[PDB]
Amino acid sequence: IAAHKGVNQAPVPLKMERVGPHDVHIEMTAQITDIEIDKGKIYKAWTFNGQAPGPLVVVNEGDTIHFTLKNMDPVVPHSMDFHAVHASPSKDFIDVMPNKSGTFTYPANKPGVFMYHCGTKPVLQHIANGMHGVIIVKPKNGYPTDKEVDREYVLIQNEWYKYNDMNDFQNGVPSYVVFSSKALKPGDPNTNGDTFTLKEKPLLAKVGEKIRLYINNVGPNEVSSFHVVGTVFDDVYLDGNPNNHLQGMQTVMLPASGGAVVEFTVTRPGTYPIVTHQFNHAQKGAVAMLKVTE
Amino acid sequence: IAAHKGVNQAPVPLKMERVGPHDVHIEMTAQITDIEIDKGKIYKAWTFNGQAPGPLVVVNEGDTIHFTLKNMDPVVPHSMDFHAVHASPSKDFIDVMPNKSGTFTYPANKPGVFMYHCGTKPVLQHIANGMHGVIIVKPKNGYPTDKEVDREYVLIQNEWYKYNDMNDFQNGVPSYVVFSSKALKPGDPNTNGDTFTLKEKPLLAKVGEKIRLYINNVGPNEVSSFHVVGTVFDDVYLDGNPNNHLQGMQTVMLPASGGAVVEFTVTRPGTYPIVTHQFNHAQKGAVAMLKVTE
Amino acid sequence: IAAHKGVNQAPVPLKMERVGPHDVHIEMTAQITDIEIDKGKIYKAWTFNGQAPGPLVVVNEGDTIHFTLKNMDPVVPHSMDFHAVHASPSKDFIDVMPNKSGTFTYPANKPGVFMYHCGTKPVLQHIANGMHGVIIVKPKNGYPTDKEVDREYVLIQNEWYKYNDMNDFQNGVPSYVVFSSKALKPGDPNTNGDTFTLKEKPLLAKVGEKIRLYINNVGPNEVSSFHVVGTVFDDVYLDGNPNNHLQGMQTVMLPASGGAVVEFTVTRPGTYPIVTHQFNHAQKGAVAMLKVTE
Ligand SMILES: [Cu+2]
Ligand SMILES: [Cu+2]
Ligand SMILES: [Cu+2]
Ligand SMILES: [Cu+2]
Ligand SMILES: [Cu+2]
Ligand SMILES: [Cu+2]
Ligand SMILES: [Cu+2]
Ligand SMILES: [Cu+2]
Ligand SMILES: [Cu+2]
Ligand SMILES: [Cu+2]
Ligand SMILES: [Cu+2]
Ligand SMILES: [Cu+2]
Ligand SMILES: [Cu+2]
Ligand SMILES: [Cu+2]
Ligand SMILES: [Cu+2]
Ligand SMILES: [Cu+2]
Ligand SMILES: [Cu+2]
Ligand SMILES: [Cu+2]
Ligand SMILES: [Cu+2]
Ligand code: NA
Ligand code: NA
Ligand code: NA
Structure with missing residues (x-):
């Protein structure tokens, strides 16, 4: 993409703070960053926060997530789909345009090791270019072991x-x-x-x-x-x-x-x-x- | 196949009737039908009953199935293999020749969501051309949920x-x-x-x-x-x-x-x-x- | 490989003896043997004991295995990795050079149907050429059925x-x-x-x-x-x-x-x-x- 030619956005730190006993704020970016995927091979990755896969998110079972995506991509829209949450895909996993932000709220009611990824069409293209990651939801009463x-x-x-x-x-x-x-x-x-x-x-x-x-x-x-x-x-x-x-x-x-x-x-x-x-x-x-x- | 050139057999309805508290009669066809699989793309499918996948069959756990296949294909033999049943493949999943019928009897003793398909050699060719479907066997005492x-x-x-x-x-x-x-x-x-x-x-x-x-x-x-x-x-x-x-x-x-x-x-x-x-x-x-x- | 040209080592029998209530000795070979994989098609397989997959090994849960590999390959090193055992891969799954033997000891503490294979780099090449097999570890108290x-x-x-x-x-x-x-x-x-x-x-x-x-x-x-x-x-x-x-x-x-x-x-x-x-x-x-x- 012509507009990505010579774009290399430095990684931004995941921003996270708990605002309640069951409410968390998380802020991520969508951004374009060069990653060395093999020795001598650069991939101009489509990322969350300049990492591919994206940064680790850890919440507790029953947390409600108040999510903000800042889209730093100068041309391509991006979005966020957390596998952990119950949401409306067509209202809550929508595209955030270039240079804009969107904030969405949804609960994580099941414990596990869930994938997260961009949900923008075509979804294969956004995932394969690097827009994936994991969100861990800790169980309320732990694991037996x-x-x-x-x-x-x-x-x-x-x-x-x-x-x-x-x-x-x-x-x-x-x-x-x-x-x-x-x-x-x-x-x-x-x-x-x-x-x-x-x-x-x-x-x-x-x-x-x-x-x-x-x-x-x-x-x-x-x-x-x-x-x-x-x-x-x-x-x-x-x-x-x-x-x-x-x-x-x-x-x-x-x-x-x-x-x-x-x-x-x-x-x-x-x-x-x-x-x-x-x-x-x-x-x-x-x-x-x-x-x-x- | 030359003999399928310009064959398009209209869909026939699944025929089913219960003949006993644990006995069911089912009658299907093997037939050749044009299916639009993608916009503007026709596939002259090998089907059961002019549908691909085939029609839904639903029985109860412990039912014995008395199955009839009418083979409407003018040149290729077809057969039926239900994953739900206990049967002899070489006696009960045999080929039915063109323009003929065969009737087979076998029990469905396990609950589930079972595949069914044509079992004629080469089996890959008959499955890939469209001869598959599902038979649901309802559990006697339901699901917990x-x-x-x-x-x-x-x-x-x-x-x-x-x-x-x-x-x-x-x-x-x-x-x-x-x-x-x-x-x-x-x-x-x-x-x-x-x-x-x-x-x-x-x-x-x-x-x-x-x-x-x-x-x-x-x-x-x-x-x-x-x-x-x-x-x-x-x-x-x-x-x-x-x-x-x-x-x-x-x-x-x-x-x-x-x-x-x-x-x-x-x-x-x-x-x-x-x-x-x-x-x-x-x-x-x-x-x-x-x-x-x- | 030039050195395998016209090598066809006849199959050698698996050697196994129990030396204690929980200790077993097993001796295998790594060897090069022609296998007819399809009618008229020979594959000069890299094998354990002239079989591909290798011979069946059966032990009991809690057995310690004292393993000897005789490497009959005239040029390529080989090794053994049992999925059943707890071991150090870099000390216990090491290469045994051509014409040499190595003996390793490790316990099989879990019951199952475990893969075994050569662990020599590149591992894909050694597996694909035929160096795989299965080791069954019998459960102490059997299966319920x-x-x-x-x-x-x-x-x-x-x-x-x-x-x-x-x-x-x-x-x-x-x-x-x-x-x-x-x-x-x-x-x-x-x-x-x-x-x-x-x-x-x-x-x-x-x-x-x-x-x-x-x-x-x-x-x-x-x-x-x-x-x-x-x-x-x-x-x-x-x-x-x-x-x-x-x-x-x-x-x-x-x-x-x-x-x-x-x-x-x-x-x-x-x-x-x-x-x-x-x-x-x-x-x-x-x-x-x-x-x-x-
Ligand atoms: Cu609380
Ligand atoms: Cu908030
Ligand atoms: Cu995206
Ligand atoms: Cu999802
Ligand atoms: Cu998904
Ligand atoms: Cu410990
Ligand atoms: Cu009854
Ligand atoms: Cu009948
Ligand atoms: Cu068929
Ligand atoms: Cu079957
Ligand atoms: Cu099958
Ligand atoms: Cu309800
Ligand atoms: Cu003992
Ligand atoms: Cu010993
Ligand atoms: Cu090897
Ligand atoms: Cu292993
Ligand atoms: Cu392995
Ligand atoms: Cu699986
Ligand atoms: Cu018996
Ligand atoms: Na999705
Ligand atoms: Na079958
Ligand atoms: Na291994």
């Missing part, structure tokens, strides 16, 4: 195609399939979807810990066979709802937009790859590392 | 390829992925698998209702990530068995031939898209609309 | 691509998708992944039996929609863990590397096809037969 959990991270899987190529987006195989991590607490890694960053800079843990991962496969098009090498998932909660509780899985299937909470123990020191077991995708980038030390 | 349900519809997802092109059917991407609705009660929409009809003529509901959808992804080749925009599924029953009960899903993965009962609430007026969240497929047609009014 | 089960078999699904073609492995469709059976008890069929052997030589059962299948889809790349024609699965245990118990499924979705225990009844004599219901794959070979006699 919370007391066993030593450590937590958030991982997202996504695909990259030929830049802004609608024929590729529809008919082509992915050029890259990648993981990213988003921070739950200051100090945790917060990265973009690329082929290399979680290889070079592994996630960390200690020998003997039980690790919880909140995972979502945002696609846009592929399913995921998610698996951690050298362990078995003790517990899995489909979509992060406590009630959907499976045990002893080797591999967790995730639909496009699907999430889960998975928990597992690392019994010995060394480096544990994290993959999607559809190994064409793992070869195209979707291998993250977990380094476990004494 | 029946009292909460205000309204019900049936949705099927299918793919269309290059007409009668075995290389495309095997190796190609779908040209179209579509939804159709089938009627539970006179007055409900009953449509074919096309890109447009549920966009132009949405399904209807009222603000505040709990909606049940009986869904099956007949393929033939793809999986589905089924999701309703602006809501979360309160309850899901995998394959429509009451015992396979998940809660709070954002998205339901369906294998090829897979079904589910899903239930959700619409809290605000407007138009709610219904998609498969593998968004290449949604772009190729698989977006249905639900219009919710005061 | 053991008393109902009359008969058992093991089935694996895999893909074959263009020989040793990394571009095909990453970007291409499978050339073949196949089933194989592995023997639980001497006398049961033990076959390789090909298009024909379970068509010509069906699995056997008697009218009225409840049949248990232990299934795993090793991929490397595709998911499976597993379905037996003419029946409905009475019970399914995801990944073969007793706790993940679904009922009345028509079709079981399996991620890449995913497994399940499924059980079903055959009520009438004749031939029951076993398929993946993604029918492009079934057309490319993945149809097995079950013959049911009086």
Whole structure:
């Protein structure tokens, strides 16, 4: 797009504040930012807040979200669709024009690990260019296994195609399939979807810990066979709802937009790859590392 | 096929009558009918009863089905395979020759939302050309959530390829992925698998209702990530068995031939898209609309 | 590979002995063997023990496995990754050089139907060329339905691509998708992944039996929609863990590397096809037969 030529908007921080016991304000941007998705390969991504996937949003079950989107794109409208909320798509997930803002209000009444994304037509084009992310809604009474959990991270899987190529987006195989991590607490890694960053800079843990991962496969098009090498998932909660509780899985299937909470123990020191077991995708980038030390 | 050139057999109504407390007679046709699958695009479909997917069949758990197939195809044999039944495939799912009829008897002893299809070799060719559909077997004691349900519809997802092109059917991407609705009660929409009809003529509901959808992804080749925009599924029953009960899903993965009962609430007026969240497929047609009014 | 030109190493028998109440010794080979994957088509497979998929390994829950890999490949290193075990991938799933052996020890503490495979970079290349298989870990207290089960078999699904073609492995469709059976008890069929052997030589059962299948889809790349024609699965245990118990499924979705225990009844004599219901794959070979006699 001619108007995006030489646009590179620096990342803006997620703005969030709680205004009531069950009411939260969140403010995000839609903006155009260059992301290195593979070594030497830039993608002029369509983003929320200059990150792809977008920044992590965490709320509590029963929170009402008062959402503001500032659209910094100089030419293309953008919108926001949270999978966590009950809303009217045609009133509450509407387009916000270039240089304008819109504020929408809706409740998050179910716990889980929900995808979020732009809902502007054509939706495939806006998702594939980078407008996705995850919102975690914490359960009111936790998970049954919370007391066993030593450590937590958030991982997202996504695909990259030929830049802004609608024929590729529809008919082509992915050029890259990648993981990213988003921070739950200051100090945790917060990265973009690329082929290399979680290889070079592994996630960390200690020998003997039980690790919880909140995972979502945002696609846009592929399913995921998610698996951690050298362990078995003790517990899995489909979509992060406590009630959907499976045990002893080797591999967790995730639909496009699907999430889960998975928990597992690392019994010995060394480096544990994290993959999607559809190994064409793992070869195209979707291998993250977990380094476990004494 | 030369013998199908200029064949367009008008749709015939499903014939069904109950002959006992647990015995039902059903009579269908195999026939060749032109279907508009996309605007300006005709597909000379291989069908049951001139519909693709085929007509909706609804029976009760424990019913024995006495099935008759009249094969109206002037050259190609056809057969019927119900996923709901216990049968001998090589005696009970046999081919019925052109201009002949066959009658088969078998019981439906499990509740659910089962795929049905032609079982003639090569099976891919007969399915891809349009010979699929759904049979619902109602549970003897219902679902736990029946009292909460205000309204019900049936949705099927299918793919269309290059007409009668075995290389495309095997190796190609779908040209179209579509939804159709089938009627539970006179007055409900009953449509074919096309890109447009549920966009132009949405399904209807009222603000505040709990909606049940009986869904099956007949393929033939793809999986589905089924999701309703602006809501979360309160309850899901995998394959429509009451015992396979998940809660709070954002998205339901369906294998090829897979079904589910899903239930959700619409809290605000407007138009709610219904998609498969593998968004290449949604772009190729698989977006249905639900219009919710005061 | 020049050094594999005219290499055809004859199959070696799996070597297994129990050395303690909870300790087992297993010895396998990595070796290069010609497999007829389709009629008239040889694939110079990278194998464990001259079989593709590899030989069946069966242990008990809580067993510690003392594993030896003899690498008979004259040029390429190989390794072993068992999904059943808790291990350090970078110490315990390491490469064993040509003409050398390595011995590793790790526990199998969870019951199920686990994939196993070579873990040598690039992992896709080693899996796609044939280095996969299944290890069953029997539950300490069985499955709830053991008393109902009359008969058992093991089935694996895999893909074959263009020989040793990394571009095909990453970007291409499978050339073949196949089933194989592995023997639980001497006398049961033990076959390789090909298009024909379970068509010509069906699995056997008697009218009225409840049949248990232990299934795993090793991929490397595709998911499976597993379905037996003419029946409905009475019970399914995801990944073969007793706790993940679904009922009345028509079709079981399996991620890449995913497994399940499924059980079903055959009520009438004749031939029951076993398929993946993604029918492009079934057309490319993945149809097995079950013959049911009086
Ligand atoms: Cu309160
Ligand atoms: Cu406010
Ligand atoms: Cu957008
Ligand atoms: Cu969505
Ligand atoms: Cu701990
Ligand atoms: Cu593993
Ligand atoms: Cu009765
Ligand atoms: Cu009768
Ligand atoms: Cu047919
Ligand atoms: Cu079928
Ligand atoms: Cu109501
Ligand atoms: Cu949504
Ligand atoms: Cu003991
Ligand atoms: Cu030993
Ligand atoms: Cu190897
Ligand atoms: Cu693996
Ligand atoms: Cu029996
Ligand atoms: Cu069937
Ligand atoms: Cu699945
Ligand atoms: Na591995
Ligand atoms: Na949406
Ligand atoms: Na069938």
